[PDB]
Design a protein around this ligand. Structure first.
Ligand SMILES: O=C(Cn1c(-c2cccs2)cc2ccccc21)NCc1ccccn1
Length: 300
């Protein structure tokens, strides 16, 4: 499905004993399975006992797909990709073990730290310019890594990023986005749900997905960040958003967004995929601004 790692045409899979996993409570549930918070014993040398997110898959094709999923997730090792620890194949259900990200999905985190909201890692009130850039740079670093391994995401959006302790941001999700954020998808035939608001015209019109369609989605992610998690084209219905995107309309500059950052967004939104800036360049630009001294960021 769109955004699933198995859509990539790209064993060393680590196994965990069922006894080493102790389920605490459910974190969520979707069409593909349930996600629990659990304690995992003897996983990391110093740890002894550590918190993890455990995806219990619903279930053949399912067992075959599971193995291909774990192989692909095992290939990923980067500071800005949600860590995959391994599987549990003893008994049912089959389990996938991941690191636990304390602050939840990036969309929820932006909204809870934005002007429309009701203090350990973040100051009171809306996130500052420097925090917004740090968040953007980290998502970009994750996208640089995936592009380097020739992976295509297809569902890049803040809902599909997680936030951990110390404001660490990583790309990853436990396959519940269509269930938690159903309004972020356009349902085509009772089953297929498309994240049209994050998609470029070649993906909507021609159903083509590449590193360049992901860079367009990154531009939309940049916009979500600088709007504090607001839905792109929120004022438009699903058909009206398809019309705007195909007609070549671009999202307005967010109020918290400096001109320099908006130029980075527009670079991701070139009609011709070939003309879009590389993620490597997008990352270098955002990282530079993120680590800029307060004197420089204050005038931006
Ligand atoms: O596989 C993913 C997302 N995903 C990840 C990760 C998921 C966790 C940690 S990293 C890496 C990756 C690399 C290329 C493309 C997608 C990728 N999500 C699960 C899903 C999506 C849709 C429907 C059902 N299940």
């Amino acid at each position: 499905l769109q955004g699933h790692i198995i859509e990539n045409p790209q064993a060393c899979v680590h196994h965990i004993k069922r006894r080493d996993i102790v389920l605490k409570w459910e974190l969520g549930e979707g069409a593909f399975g349930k996600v629990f918070l659990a304690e995992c014993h003897n996983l990391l040398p110093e740890q002894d006992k550590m918190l993890v997110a455990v995806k219990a898959l619903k279930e053949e094709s399912a067992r075959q797909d599971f193995q291909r999923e774990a192989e692909l997730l095992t290939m990923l090792q980067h500071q800005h990709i949600v860590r995959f620890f391994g599987v549990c194949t003893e008994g049912r259900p089959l389990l996938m073990v991941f690191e636990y990200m304390r602050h939840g999905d990036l969309n929820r985190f932006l909204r809870s730290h934005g002007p429309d909201a009701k203090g350990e890692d973040v100051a009171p009130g809306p996130l500052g310019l420097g925090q917004l850039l740090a968040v953007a740079s980290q998502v970009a670093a994750g996208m640089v890594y995936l592009a380097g391994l020739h992976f295509v995401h297809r569902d890049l959006a803040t809902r599909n990023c997680l936030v951990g302790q110390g404001l660490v941001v990583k790309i990853g999700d436990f396959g519940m986005s269509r269930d938690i954020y159903s309004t972020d998808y356009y349902r085509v035939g009772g089953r297929t749900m498309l994240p049209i608001r994050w998609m470029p015209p070649e993906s909507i019109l021609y159903r083509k997905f590449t590193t360049e369609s992901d860079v367009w989605s990154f531009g939309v992610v940049l916009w979500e960040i600088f709007t504090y998690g607001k839905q792109p084209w929120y004022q438009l219905s699903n058909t009206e958003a398809i019309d705007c995107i195909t007609q070549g309309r671009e999202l307005e500059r967010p109020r918290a967004c400096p001109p320099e950052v908006y130029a980075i967004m527009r670079g991701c939104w070139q009609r011709e995929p070939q003309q879009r800036h590389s993620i490597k360049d997008v990352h270098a630009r955002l990282q530079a601004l993120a680590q800029a001294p307060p004197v420089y960021l204050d005038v931006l």
